[PDB]
Write a protein that binds this ligand. Sequence first.
Ligand SMILES: Nc1ncnc2c1ncn2[C@@H]1O[C@@H]2/C=C/P(=O)(O)O[C@H]3[C@@H](F)[C@H](n4cnc5c(N)ncnc54)O[C@@H]3COP(=O)(O)O[C@H]2[C@H]1F
Lengths: 178, 178
Amino acid sequence: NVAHGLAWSYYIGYLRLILPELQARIRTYNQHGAVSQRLYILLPLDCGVPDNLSMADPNIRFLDKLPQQTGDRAGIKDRVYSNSIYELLENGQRAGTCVLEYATPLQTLFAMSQYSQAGFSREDRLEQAKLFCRTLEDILADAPESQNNCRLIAYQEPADDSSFSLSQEVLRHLRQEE
Amino acid sequence: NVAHGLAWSYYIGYLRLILPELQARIRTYNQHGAVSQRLYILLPLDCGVPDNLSMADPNIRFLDKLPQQTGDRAGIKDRVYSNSIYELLENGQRAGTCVLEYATPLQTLFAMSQYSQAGFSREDRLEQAKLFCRTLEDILADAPESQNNCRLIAYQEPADDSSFSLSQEVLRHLRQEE
Ligand SMILES: Nc1ncnc2c1ncn2[C@@H]1O[C@@H]2/C=C/P(=O)(O)O[C@H]3[C@@H](F)[C@H](n4cnc5c(N)ncnc54)O[C@@H]3COP(=O)(O)O[C@H]2[C@H]1F
């Protein structure tokens, strides 16, 4: 159960750091469409994690970066936490604007299964992905740092069985927020 | 064995990314004392990881940041990888200059043991710290990205049994490099 530790490191080393500061950074961007107040985290269960969101879906279009957040951690001065703002397109219309990113450790899990000395079977990718999501979900429920600042989006593509829309999937979560 | 996954994520998500670019970034700083060509990674086995190196030892003094490295990862545009350059003091003399940082996942392990729903006993901190170091050591030996760019510094303090010098410990590894 490698995913257990990854989910926890994901919270301890990232989410619990940037969530308390998130709304303030969003507010500043709006003043200096309007960006939503939640961090939208993509959790593909096939552990496919492209580095370019626009490559996953054309209807997901990069707009701008948030103001950076800096902190000193583990000897590194001014470690930089950045987040990208995306516009969600529907039939050529902008249907939403939000801070959007994949959950990186899912990309780490995928990479792990490719390394022989990592002792992690490629067959277990879906299982660890599910555990990661569940663990993360349990954490953020109890997480004091998370108060209406964060939304987990987890999904299973047909994987060439059918056609899938990542933009529509995010828009779904975004419209319920409304 | 949570440390196994953390060590691997440490390599996959950090070291294998920044090590190929490290020497070039060091070279640029020297031209634009002289900084060593290796990344020196502190691995305290008690999993104590202060965020301020100068608080660990006064003889470890922050000098400057390296040139930043940027890349797009998992939907985040221009994710920033930064590193701090430190001067090592000995009897008021500068005995060395190098890129120096703790290994962050050791701080994550420590934090994990404090969380009840993380299911990680505080007694196991030393054990996981050892596994983390060993796993990381095995990886970097086989790691193609690591060619004379990286040095692991692992240690056990007396923990108030005696007085310990972190600067002298780093200087030891640094002088063998010479
Ligand atoms: N710039 C860096 N400067 C120093 N060290 C780094 C950096 N990069 C990786 N490292 C080391 O490599 C480990 C990474 C395993 P991962 O698979 O990438 O998942 C990580 C990651 F998804 C998420 N996260 C953390 N910061 C950010 C960020 N700025 N933007 C987006 N996501 C972030 O938190 C997980 C673990 O967080 P940690 O800090 O505790 O551990 C890290 C750490 F040891």
